[PDB]
């Protein structure tokens, strides 16, 4: 028994009506449950049979569907309803649907940090690029060393959406050996987001 959950991620404003659909690969009668999970939190049961609301869940959460459709409708979205939702078919759970707060597009404030002198003495150089308060979360980050793309020696993470301005922040770390970091001069970090690219750079030793 297989599960396909769609959409992977949607963005909606407060008070909107959202629908999350997850489909089984065969007849499942009414053996489908819905769960809500916030980041760093514990999953919470919303609806268990196919439309039977769990006690304590607000009326805005509704379930429906027969066969393999099995939608999930929130009539009026609320600030506390922005989280990831899962559907369960017997022993199989869906990929999940992320509900995002809709907001205006915002260009990130880009900062670049050269590796600290303290870290250089241990033989490893880490240069960090900061993207501050941008929207949407989809942003491409690239590293250029002496005008040459690195492409395979960096990692990044994204903070959870801010509760005030509903924006995201990203931190990317380019990891190089001390020897390699001192064989080059120009270090640049580029942010590509919606027909706009911003490149913050610095020159080592300057």
């Amino acid at each position: 028994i297989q599960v396909t959950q769609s959409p992977s991620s949607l963005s909606a404003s407060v008070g909107d009506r959202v629908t999350i659909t997850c489909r089984a690969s065969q007849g499942i009668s009414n053996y489908l449950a819905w769960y809500q999970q916030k980041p760093g939190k514990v999953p919470k049961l919303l609806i268990y049979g196919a439309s039977t609301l769990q006690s304590g869940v607000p009326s805005r959460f509704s379930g429906s569907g027969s066969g393999t459709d099995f939608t999930l409708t929130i009539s009026s979205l609320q600030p506390e309803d922005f989280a990831t939702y899962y559907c369960q078919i017997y022993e199989t759970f869906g990929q999940g649907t992320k509900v995002d707060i809709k907001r205006t597009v915002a260009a990130p404030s880009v900062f670049i940090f050269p590796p600290s002198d303290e870290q250089l003495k241990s033989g490893t150089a880490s240069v960090v690029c900061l993207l501050n308060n941008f929207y949407p979360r989809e942003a491409k980050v690239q590293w250029k060393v002496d005008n040459a793309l690195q492409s395979g020696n960096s990692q990044e993470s994204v903070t959870e959406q801010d509760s005030k301005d509903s924006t995201y922040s990203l931190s990317s770390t380019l990891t190089l050996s001390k020897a390699d970091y001192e064989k080059h001069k120009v270090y640049a970090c580029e942010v590509t987001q919606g027909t706009t690219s911003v490149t913050k750079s610095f020159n080592r030793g300057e």
Partner: protein
Amino acid sequence: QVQLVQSGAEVKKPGASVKVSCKTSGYTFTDFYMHWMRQAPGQGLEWMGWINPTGGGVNYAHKFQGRVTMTRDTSISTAYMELSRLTSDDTGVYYCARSPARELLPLDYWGQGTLVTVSSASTKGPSVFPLAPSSTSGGTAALGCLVKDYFPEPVTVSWNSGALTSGVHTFPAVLQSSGLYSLSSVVTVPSSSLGTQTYICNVNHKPSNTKVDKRVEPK
């Protein structure tokens, strides 16, 4: 009230085994099934198995068949889950969830979770390096700390002993190719205070019982 309390976090070498308890209260422990879940970092939930507390009968998923052992102790209303021959993709957060009768679909109540980290790395304290500011971004400057090469999760970062909270972004840690975690915490401050206001990041790594305070000075 219906409550499920699990044991603390565990760190295991590959090939070892981990046992997690689930102490329940507020309901008849023998009248409901007890399931075991796990969630890899950044992944979804998957079902490992359940145990009927009345007779101890179990039903494991085929993925964990022959590698997971689920027991219970009715006298203390506790359910146990053991996973042997651990590997890197056994790292995750494990839950115990309650289901009614001889069912598995409705999971009404869950435990708080137990973080199990499996790696050949050993518990190590972090190396905190400064993200020193200079400014070239108007009246706002950015500074922070780079918490580097620590194991296992988690670490907590505050600024000025919690006095500085506005504009603070503490990013999720990333797992490096060496098996050590590394994250960064940043804060945006007025550029006019770089040379006078003292900024100190307080990094606490409870697994190694190491607390590092680092002052970030402008260059």
